[PDB]
Design an enzyme around this catalytic site. Structure first.
Site, PDB file in Angstrom:
ATOM      1  N   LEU A 109      46.707  27.086  38.842  1.00  0.00           N
ATOM      2  CA  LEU A 109      46.142  28.072  39.761  1.00  0.00           C
ATOM      3  C   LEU A 109      44.617  28.085  39.714  1.00  0.00           C
ATOM      4  CD1 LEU A 109      46.809  30.226  41.808  1.00  0.00           C
ATOM      5  CD2 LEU A 109      47.319  31.814  39.960  1.00  0.00           C
ATOM      6  N   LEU A 122      25.576  36.769  32.985  1.00  0.00           N
ATOM      7  CA  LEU A 122      26.211  37.995  32.513  1.00  0.00           C
ATOM      8  C   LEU A 122      27.669  37.790  32.086  1.00  0.00           C
ATOM      9  CD1 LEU A 122      24.707  40.238  35.340  1.00  0.00           C
ATOM     10  CD2 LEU A 122      23.903  40.080  32.971  1.00  0.00           C
TER      11      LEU A 122
END
Ligand SMILES: CCCCCCCCCCCCCC(=O)SCCNC(=O)CCNC(=O)[C@H](O)C(C)(C)COP(=O)(O)OP(=O)(O)OC[C@H]1O[C@@H](n2cnc3c(N)ncnc32)[C@H](O)[C@@H]1OP(=O)(O)O
Ligand SMILES: Cc1nn(C)c(C)c1N(C)S(=O)(=O)c1c(Cl)cc(CCCN2CCN3CCC[C@@H]3C2)cc1Cl
Length: 411
Positions: free
Chosen positions: A170, A411
């Protein structure tokens, strides 16, 4: 060996990356009109979903997926627990493109199964200084300078597949659909980071950690008690003494950043970051978004003297779930963000960062050895960790560089 990555426009081996001399694209030139209008095919029980990352419940859905399924350490002791407010901050910077936030849901019940996010960034990614020297020696300066202009690209983060759907291929579908949506916006490069080794990083840096609450870090097995401490009758009281920090900042004129500081902070930050081979270019709006304080998310302080901002530092919060220890729910980590020093040594500026983080209840301060982070490791008692952060481009040949030539915080 890589059924997916072997089909992608990335350098395929370290030996290939070792031979790259100039920055530039890898794929055939394409236009938006060449890119499929329709989403990538997915099995009939699944559907693509574009969450609204300014809608509280959509953020909460992604928050839960990451909380339960995102990055773990190799011993499954810790898992990132990015907060809802952090996700809204990281995913919705100025001029962000909602369509670049890509999710997969089970069609029947709309259960969120997978996610990947892209945000726009303007990045200097031209040929690095050391390779421009070689190009000049060889009469190839024009080609080495071709892609010097800062480029409007995609930064990819937060790839996640539910644990129950792992190893079903996936992740390639998510990556392919993200690539399609970014390409449909006439953007052809991406930058991303990972702890794992993929084909093929242009830079890699070790993580470093500064203990702020050592008794907790030892208890949760984030830190160990070094062997040399066994020569003392109470190794833990010695450990706490070693890491103790002042209760208040030492730099006169340190205060939290405020909106009127944005232009000065932009100027000093940009002057500093321009010295690195790879780094972001920030507008006033982006400085405001990424640096103005947000409770529980980002913390930014400036040194002001003579009514001028001369230095600043920032840090952000990412707690991690402590999976195996029942005595603590979370490890509260502060991550070194951007900074700039013009009036004091960097170690003096970052000491104030550690003090503020300790005072606010953080357990550890983390960073990767990018920017000038190595220059304060020893003085401020950072220790090297097990982890590395590897930096990658999609569709961009780039020579290997040292992590101290990287100025992009991810981040
Ligand atoms: C121009 C615009 C371009 C935009 C896109 C630019 C590219 C962005 C690329 C994404 C940057 C993301 C930056 C971050 O967020 S790094 C953080 C990644 N997230 C996590 O580690 C969270 C926990 N793990 C998971 O959720 C999954 O295990 C993931 C989703 C990681 C893989 O799912 P799963 O375990 O169920 O495997 P699969 O059977 O579906 O697929 C296997 C294929 O996946 C390749 N794989 C494994 N890990 C990664 C990885 N971290 N980046 C890229 N590829 C990865 C693997 O080599 C294999 O390909 P190949 O070896 O057969 O060829
Ligand atoms: C306390 C804690 N919680 N978790 C979850 C871990 C692993 C720890 N550690 C034990 S660690 O020492 O602090 C540590 C370690 Cl081993 C390894 C890495 C590798 C980078 C992982 N990703 C990939 C995706 N994203 C890109 C930018 C940020 C994020 C970083 C990071 C860290 Cl942060």
């Amino acid at each position: 060996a890589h059924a997916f990555w072997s089909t992608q426009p990335v350098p395929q081996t370290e030996d290939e990356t070792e031979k790259i001399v100039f920055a530039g694209p890898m794929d055939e030139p394409k236009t938006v009109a060449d890119i499929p209008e329709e989403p990538y095919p997915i099995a009939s029980t699944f559907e693509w979903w574009t969450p609204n990352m300014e809608a509280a419940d959509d953020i909460h859905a992604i928050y839960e997926l990451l909380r339960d399924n995102y990055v773990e350490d190799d011993d499954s002791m810790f898992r990132f627990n990015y907060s809802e407010e952090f996700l809204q901050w990281a995913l919705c910077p100025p001029n962000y493109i909602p369509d670049w936030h890509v999710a997969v849901r089970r069609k029947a019940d709309k259960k969120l199964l997978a996610f990947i996010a892209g945000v726009p960034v303007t990045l200097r990614m031209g040929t690095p200084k050391y390779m421009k020297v070689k190009a000049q020696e060889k009469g190839e300066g024009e080609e080495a300078a071709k892609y010097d202009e800062p480029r409007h690209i995609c930064e990819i983060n937060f790839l996640c597949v539910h644990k129950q759907l792992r190893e079903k291929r996936l992740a390639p579908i998510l990556i392919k659909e993200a690539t399609r949506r970014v390409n449909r916006t006439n953007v052809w490069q991406a930058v991303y980071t990972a702890g794992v080794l993929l084909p093929t990083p242009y830079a890699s840096g070790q993580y470093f950690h500064r203990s702020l609450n050592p008794e907790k870090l030892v208890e949760i097995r984030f830190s160990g008690i070094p062997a040399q401490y066994q020569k003392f009758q109470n190794p833990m009281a010695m450990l706490k003494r070693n890491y103790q920090l002042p209760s208040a900042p030492k730099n006169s004129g340190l205060r939290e950043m405020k909106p009127s500081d944005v232009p000065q902070v932009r100027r000093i930050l940009m002057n500093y970051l321009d010295s690195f081979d790879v780094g972001p270019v920030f507008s006033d709006a982006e400085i405001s978004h990424y640096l103005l304080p947000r409770d529980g998310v980002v913390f930014t302080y400036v040194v002001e003297n003579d009514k001028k901002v001369t230095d600043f530092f920032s840090f952000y919060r990412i707690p991690s779930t402590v999976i195996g220890n029942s005595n603590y729910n979370l490890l509260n980590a502060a991550y070194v963000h951007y900074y700039a020093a013009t009036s004091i040594p960097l170690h003096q500026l970052i000491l104030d960062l550690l003090i503020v983080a300790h005072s606010r209840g953080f357990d550890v301060c983390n960073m990767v050895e990018i920017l000038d982070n190595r220059s304060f490791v020893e003085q401020l008692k950072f220790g090297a960790g097990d982890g590395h952060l590897r930096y990658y481009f999609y569709n961009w040949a780039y020579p290997k560089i040292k992590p101290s030539q990287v100025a992009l915080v991810m981040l």
